Amino acid sequence: ASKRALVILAKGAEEMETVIPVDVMRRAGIKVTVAGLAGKDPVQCSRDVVICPDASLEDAKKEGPYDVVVLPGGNLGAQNLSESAAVKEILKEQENRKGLIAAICAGPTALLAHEIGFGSKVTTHPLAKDKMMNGGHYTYSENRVEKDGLILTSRGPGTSFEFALAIVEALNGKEVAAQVKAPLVLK
Amino acid sequence: ASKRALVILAKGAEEMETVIPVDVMRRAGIKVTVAGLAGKDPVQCSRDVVICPDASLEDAKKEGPYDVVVLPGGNLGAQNLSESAAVKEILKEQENRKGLIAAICAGPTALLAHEIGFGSKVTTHPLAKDKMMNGGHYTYSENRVEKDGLILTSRGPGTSFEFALAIVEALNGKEVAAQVKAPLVLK
């Protein structure tokens, strides 16, 4: 079987947190769709790297369901994800069907904005903790990667590989994750 | 002073090895130019991530000199860099002016193709070692990041942050590198 992943790309997204998971998941044989929040046009990321999405979020959502919905970080990117009604719908449906939801660095704050996974233990970038914890709807963790059921979170660009490999393990198992990890030269 | 970096992007380049250094260098205040080898059109990377270069290599080379020329990996990308006469010229001029040259994973094999930095200690991805060592023109290292004078090399996607931070330290110093590293959440 071939798992499917939806990565939602918005203006201001952290490019490393977008590309590392996309790349690693594809190395794991996961069919990944990089969906542009604003449409099919190129997206200017946080450090000006411009990525051309595979399709618009509008079209991509029509090709669901996905085994995992991935939310990259980047403050401005996360804010755009948090303000999107389309994102809210996708996350609510994914949660309802018991599908994996993964967010990294500032990305988890989008879960808060859409009231997703309340009651879960989560982590975020240290600078995004206060925002994420507003209201005490989650229990905070300092672990590099935190997985509480179907809510998988991570802390920053530097934890992107661990984050991606955790997604791979959840979808394709520990063996596949180990096989994909080796050639990456991660110590 | 504001250092300048030239990142040469070719079809088949490893997107993580392209984006991590670009992102990290920009966080370090380095003026980075993502130059498309084939032109100004979007580049399809090794794991299908499509990046739109800031400019064509042709135009970018006219805005030199650069404090560092960066060669991402990815077998097909490295091969394209190795076959480019334009790349050969840029690297030879950078070497001649005693400018830093950085290559990662499969990227160093391009140095071999253009006879750059012979006699230097270098590292590459384990799978690129035999190609790099053809003729014994370099001395091989297993270090995650190897720097011998103006030739800086690294092993793979998983060493991209160390590689990028080494470039930052060489250009802007140890203090700046430490400041940029902290928010990345690298352990």
Side-chain angles (χ1 to χ4, degrees), chain A residues 1-83:
Chain A
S2 57
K3 305 292 180 179
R4 302 180 61 181
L6 174 70
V7 178
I8 307 178
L9 179 56
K11 187 181 191 304
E14 221 299 326
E15 44 270 78
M16 297 187 286
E17 298 170 5
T18 297
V19 176
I20 292 173
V22 170
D23 191 314
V24 174
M25 288 193 289
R26 283 182 171 151
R27 283 170 179 255
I30 295 171
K31 219 286 190 177
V32 185
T33 296
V34 178
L37 180 63
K40 56 185 64 180
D41 294 353
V43 177
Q44 187 184 188
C45 297
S46 69
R47 273 63 188 185
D48 281 341
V49 167
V50 292
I51 299 173
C52 300
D54 296 316
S56 65
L57 182 61
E58 182 174 357
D59 287 328
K61 67 179 181 181
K62 291 179 173 58
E63 300 305 302
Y66 298 85
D67 299 279
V68 64
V69 180
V70 185
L71 270 35
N75 287 320
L76 281 62
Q79 185 62 54
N80 280 320
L81 295 173
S82 297
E83 298 175 355

Side-chain angles (χ1 to χ4, degrees), chain A residues 105-184:
Chain A
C105 200
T109 62
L111 301 182
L112 170 61
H114 301 305
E115 310 191 322
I116 303 296
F118 281 6
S120 304
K121 270 200 60 177
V122 306
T123 190
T124 68
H125 181 89
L127 296 177
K129 179 185 179 179
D130 291 355
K131 188 177 188 66
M132 186 67 173
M133 291 302 101
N134 185 183
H137 296 293
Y138 306 99
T139 294
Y140 205 82
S141 168
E142 270 185 296
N143 292 317
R144 297 175 65 68
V145 177
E146 188 62 57
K147 186 177 182 298
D148 197 4
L150 302 166
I151 300 294
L152 193 167
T153 55
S154 200
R155 319 204 74 188
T159 64
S160 290
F161 286 98
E162 291 155 278
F163 172 66
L165 290 172
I167 294 174
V168 170
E169 180 177 355
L171 271 50
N172 294 329
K174 204 172 182 181
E175 237 312 75
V176 175
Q179 304 172 334
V180 49
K181 183 180 182 181
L184 298 176

